[PDB]
Write a protein that binds this ligand. Structure first.
Ligand code: CL
Ligand code: CL
Ligand code: NA
Ligand code: NA
Lengths: 222, 222
């Protein structure tokens, strides 16, 4: 009906009430806020941990249970984050070992989009990033390319906006999920170098910058 | 002649004065202690950071310079170590992206043996482990398999000794360098599961245990 629910299954959230384009996916256990805005047998919701808005099919209501304990965001110090980055990187490596393909809006696995892999990898240790690549760029602390260290985010796009993100490893290498047309159709490793293969070069040409995760996302009120 | 030197090039150290079997390799910059024990146009040495003994060809003396600042081991807290594990894992991933093959005694890269990859990966952040897999098992804090987390070491061997080591990632996966006969002839990823491929199964059958790195090696006196 209305208010805070928790999901009992992985749920697809869409950009619009038409439900033709996936915006994100809400892993079982996550909390969401259900509004009274119904259109086209869908309902407008937002996810509690990242404030991400979308549309849920009304047929997924059987997979919602009312929350009895409200979601309250945990606070991480920069040191706490630093200690968890090994697990974040390991998540991406484990993901790369599964059969996977790029999935627009993919967030629960095994199929991810670029910003969805980042969110999932950080959320596997309880750190919340916003969902979209341009939001991740805005949420992290900008650093120079020279300052990149393992677990920093690398941003790519146009001069106007970030449209792609990856996770830095070492010595120019980074892990990301990339699409069929420009990339690898799933998770792989590229290098920020003109000495890379053709896929690497194509992303290198689009490099915008880099960011460091220094806090976990605290939801707006509300 | 005698005492503490620093190397100007990557140097091969052998098990014996015959110099037919590589024991370790000393990366440029490392310090070593040269003894007066000469045999067969080789000289007995030990490496300062890990106390590892071996034989250096006398023809490598042109790549030694006397040390003017003695090696003094740094101390790392468990927290400091935890913060560097992301870089250690990233090192192994970067290594896996280079053309590489198993190399007995391989320590400087790009070709490693199993315990050599571990030493190199930790040394890339300034943490010193002993060189051999059985020494690594003795130096780490034993943990149960259930307690494994990213950056822990996984040990394999017989009921009597560890003979192989890898670096734990997540959800049973670990990275290691493995030989031609049982393994992958270089760096790859396997799983601690009966659901793995044949290479994974062969190592799983040999699993001894696990260890956590909780300090950096402090050389003996001397
Ligand atoms: Cl839509
Ligand atoms: Cl020898
Ligand atoms: Na790094
Ligand atoms: Na882990």
């Amino acid at each position: 009906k209305l208010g805070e629910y928790q999901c009992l299954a992985d749920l697809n959230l869409f950009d619009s009430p038409e439900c033709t384009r996936l915006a994100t996916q809400s892993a079982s256990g996550r909390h969401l806020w259900v509004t009274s805005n119904h259109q086209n047998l869908a309902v407008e919701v937002y996810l509690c941990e990242d404030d991400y808005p979308g549309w849920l099919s009304l047929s997924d209501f059987d997979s919602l249970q009312p929350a009895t304990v409200p979601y309250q965001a945990a606070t991480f110090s920069e040191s706490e984050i630093k200690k968890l980055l090994a697990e974040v990187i390991a998540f991406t490596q484990k993901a790369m070992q599964q059969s996977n393909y790029y999935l627009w809006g993919g967030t629960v696995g095994p199929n991810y989009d670029c910003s969805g892999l980042m969110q999932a990898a950080f959320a596997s240790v309880g750190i919340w990033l916003p969902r979209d690549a341009y939001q991740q760029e805005g949420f992290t602390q900008p650093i120079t390319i020279a300052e990149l260290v393992a677990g920093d985010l690398v941003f790519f796009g146009t001069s106007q906006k970030a449209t792609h993100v990856g996770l830095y490893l070492a010595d120019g290498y980074y892990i990301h999920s990339s699409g069929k047309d420009q990339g690898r159709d799933g998770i792989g490793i590229d290098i920020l170098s003109e000495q890379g293969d053709a896929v690497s070069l194509s992303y290198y040409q689009q490099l915008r910058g880099a960011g460091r995760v220094f806090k976990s996302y605290e939801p707006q009120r509300r």
